[PDB]
A paper describes a structure:
Green fluorescent protein (GFP), which was discovered in the jellyfish Aequorea victoria, is a light-emitting protein consisting of 238 amino acids. GFP absorbs UV–blue light and emits green light. The structure consists of an 11-stranded β-barrel plugged by a chromophore [Fig. 1(a)]. The chromophore is 4-(p-hydroxybenzylidene)imidazolin-5-one, which is formed from three intrinsic residues (Ser65, Tyr66 and Gly67) in the polypeptide chain by a post-translational cyclization, dehydration and oxidation.
We used two different variants, S65T and E222Q, for the B form. The S65T substitution changes the conformation of Glu222 by relocating the hydroxyl group of the 65th residue. The donors and acceptors in the hydrogen bonds among Glu222, Ser205, a water and the chromophore switch with each other from those in the A form of wild-type GFP. Consequently, the chromophore becomes anionic, while Glu222 becomes neutral. The Cζ–Oη bond in the A form is 1.365 (10) Å, which is 0.05 Å longer compared with those in the B form: 1.314 (7) Å (S65T) or 1.315 (8) Å (E222Q). On the other hand, the structures of the B form (S65T and E222Q) differed from almost all of them. The difference in the orientation of Wat3 leads to a knock-on effect on the hydrogen-bonding network between Oη of the chromophore and Oγ of Ser205. On the other hand, the hydrogen-bonding patterns around Ser/Thr65 and Glu/Gln222 are significantly different [Figs. 5(c), 5(d) and 5(e)], while both S65T and E222Q are in the B form. The hydroxyl H atom of Thr65 in S65T is hydrogen-bonded to N2 of the imidazolinone ring of the chromophore, while the corresponding H atom of Ser65 in E222Q is hydrogen-bonded to Gln222. Although both the S65T and E222Q variants have spectroscopic features of the chromophore in the B form, the hydrogen bonds between Thr203 and the chromophore appear to differ.
Numbering used by the authors: 2 to 64, 68 to 231
The structure:
């Protein structure tokens, strides 16, 4: 795609989110950069409204799959870069097993040379002292497979996957994800064969930062297609 050529180097990223979870309103701003050549993301997020009212890990998937590394032989399956620069809408329902749900709608597109992810998040049905509103999730992150399929009538894609959040008692909080993405612009986009993105993420803190924040280092590779 022409879109692909926009990602051969390091690209600066901005993330802006506004959220309302059970009437707790909040905002997050993030900055960093992506290097799709290496499937690599580096960002720092800051809650600008005070304390974040949900655990940071629960927002990772919401906070730019155009930075995944597509092997050369899988170039024809990279919807995400093909929609650039005009971008794509990304919508999800995230269902926290035996707790509430997030519904997210985001638009991912270039503003100048910067790749931007603008998100609105709404959370309902949460338990006041469940794992989310009760802040019972560990500050860490597991490795997943994101299963993608074409969604031809939308000129886009779907994804379906299961995120695992470790709980501080040693258990696990499942977050089922269902995702749909729709291109914004009028150039041709790539409608892929079924495949998956293999993810890994490391969460950390900046020792000099006293605002509520998250540092994220993430690597993602497309897989599941041999030729």
């Amino acid at each position: 795609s022409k879109g692909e050529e926009l990602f051969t180097g390091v690209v600066p990223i901005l993330v802006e989110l506004d959220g309302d979870v059970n009437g707790h309103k909040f905002s997050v701003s993030g900055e960093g950069e992506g290097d799709a050549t290496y499937g690599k993301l580096t960002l720092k997020f800051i809650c600008t409204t005070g304390k974040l009212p949900v655990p940071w890990p629960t927002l990772v998937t919401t906070f730019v799959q155009c930075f995944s590394r597509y092997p050369d032989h899988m170039k024809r399956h990279d919807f995400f870069k093909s929609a650039m620069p005009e971008g794509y809408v990304q919508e999800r329902t995230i269902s926290f097993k035996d707790d509430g749900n997030y519904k997210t709608r985001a638009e991912v597109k270039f503003e100048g040379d910067t790749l931007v992810n603008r998100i609105e998040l709404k959370g309902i049905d949460f338990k006041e002292d469940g794992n989310i509103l009760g802040h019972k999730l560990e500050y860490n992150y597991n490795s997943h497979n994101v299963y993608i399929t074409a969604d031809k009538q939308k000129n886009g894609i779907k994804a379906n996957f299961k995120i695992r959040h470790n709980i501080e008692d040693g258990s696990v909080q499942l977050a089922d994800h269902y995702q749909q993405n729709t291109p914004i612009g009028d150039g041709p986009v790539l409608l892929p064969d079924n495949h998956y993105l293999s993810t890994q993420s490391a969460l950390s803190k900046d020792p000099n930062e006293k605002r509520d924040h998250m540092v994220l280092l993430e690597f993602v590779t497309a897989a599941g297609i041999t030729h």
